[PDB]
């Protein structure tokens, strides 16, 4: 694409600069370019990719929620109906969000996932695939909320199956996957019991494995465990 003429190493370097500058749209474009070079990504590079798109889509999701809220309020009884603008603008943001999700899913399908041989890489990408189908699910309504939801579920499930076979219970990727799949169950699949069960089992199995960790690994794992606890506190 537009990044075809830039060196891979230069794209990675610029993604890092863009992160420092809080220029996440640029960071995402640089990392898209890097992926499209066709080489596998290192752990650091996978993190850059995920941080970039998480920030971009995060902004879009926040905006969509504000707009959807206004739209809902404008459509109720006992105030005023004031034209197509709120719907139009929510739709515009929605379409842009869907576009970013499709871009990320495109990168994962062509060809990050299939080239990911190791557990750490494959679980990371399948978690991402689950996440970006989840974001699509958040805004879906028509002939396709169900198929989108199933696509999220399938990706998360495959990731979970690999993670349980190949990674210890404290592995941050395994923990983050479980955190997000738990949120999928609560917020998307209307499965709050599955959400709570998953968060609790993940937390407890991690607790029991903390003794094997260095101080630094401990810090990383416990950070995500706290997020599991935060969610459980919200839900129970």
């Amino acid at each position: 694409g537009a990044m075809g003429s830039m060196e891979r190493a230069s794209l990675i370097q610029k993604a890092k600069l863009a992160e420092q500058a809080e220029r996440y749209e640029d960071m995402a474009a640089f990392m898209k370019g890097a992926v499209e070079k066709g080489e596998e990504l290192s752990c650091e590079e996978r993190n850059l990719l995920s941080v970039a798109y998480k920030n971009v889509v995060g902004g879009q999701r926040a905006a969509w929620r504000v707009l959807s809220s206004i739209e809902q309020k404008s459509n109720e009884e006992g105030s005023e109906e004031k034209g197509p603008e709120v719907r139009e603008y929510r739709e515009k943001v929605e379409t842009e969000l869907q576009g970013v999700c499709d871009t990320v899913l495109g990168l994962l399908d062509s060809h990050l996932i299939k080239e990911a041989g190791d557990a750490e890489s494959r679980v990371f990408y399948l978690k991402m695939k689950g996440d970006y189908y989840r974001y699509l699910a958040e805004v879906a309504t028509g002939d396709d909320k169900k198929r989108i939801i199933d696509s999220a579920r399938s990706a998360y499930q495959e990731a979970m199956d690999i993670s349980k076979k190949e990674m210890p219970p404290t592995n941050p990727i395994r923990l983050g996957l479980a955190l997000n799949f738990s949120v999928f169950h609560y917020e998307i699949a209307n499965s709050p019991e599955e959400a709570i069960s998953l968060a609790k089992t993940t937390f407890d199995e991690a607790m029991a494995d903390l003794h094997t960790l260095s101080e630094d690994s401990y810090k990383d794992s416990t950070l995500i465990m706290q997020l599991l606890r935060d969610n459980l506190t919200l839900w129970t």
Binding site: D131, G176, L179, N180, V183, I224, L227, D230, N231, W235
Partner: peptide
Amino acid sequence: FPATV
């Protein structure tokens, strides 16, 4: 809203 990473 719940935490994700």
